[PDB]
């Protein structure tokens with residue numbers, strides 16, 4: 001729902017993100033929130049505003065809540081659940097020697113659950129990666145910035161060959177046909193799992209986007225992380241089938257994950 005900025009407070013600067021500055025603050029006094037000021041000229045505003053009403057009704061424990069927005073001024077404000085420990089990529093890098101494999105698999109259960117809820121709502125992320133997931137004060141991981149890429153005006157961020165396109169998370173059908181589906185989000189989730197168990201290493205770090213696209217197209221797959229068991233690796237590898245329909249759904253994926261968690265006792 002719309003929020004009167006009168007009911008907001010700006011308390012701290014968190015930095016400028018992909019879509020503009022973000023600040024920590026309090027909503028209605030008792031709610032820790034993160035307020036994003038939408039970079040001007042970056043978004044299809046009218047379309048984005050109308051779609052925001054759809055993305056507001058999405059609720060799930062492992063999905064960064066949207067509490068509301070302020071659109072009756074510019075820049076649009078986005079009021080979201082405050083994730084004190086920030087992006088999963090940076091949480092992973094700062095705490096490399098703190099994670100036991102049980103917490104890593106947990107982080108995968110969190111993400112997989114959020115993506116299974118998005119699967120059940122027929123809502124695609126289109127840019128699933130570790131850089132778009134956030135962590136709250138209890139170490140829980142939650143997905144964010146879902147569906148945002150549908151409204152970026154910069155064509156580098158959108159085209160298959162754009163200099164800013166996340167090639168390293170894209171499925172072959174996204175690179176070759178721009179056919180976005182839940183299966184491409186599954187491929188991306190596989191890459192994300194690899195990020196998690198790699199503790200935030202860049203997938204195909206020493207490959208240009210073109211080199212990555214071509215290697216993937218001819219069968220190359222990420223190496224088993226040092227901290228990944230052969231069963232976890234089997235799961236993220238099953239996410240990377242050439243045939244999209246050959247990839248397991250997030251529900252089947254969550255089940256396999258939970259089987260591994262049970263077997264790690």
Ligand SMILES: Nc1ncnc2c1c(-c1ccc(Oc3ccccc3)cc1)nn2[C@H]1CCCNC1
Nearest residue numbers: 014015022034036064078080082083144145146
């Ligand atoms: N929610 C946060 N909690 C804590 N930290 C945060 C955020 C955000 C953030 C704000 C709005 C936002 O919009 C959304 C769009 C679609 C769905 C959900 C949200 C997405 C993310 N940035 N940051 C930090 C990360 C590190 C660098 N500085 C900024």
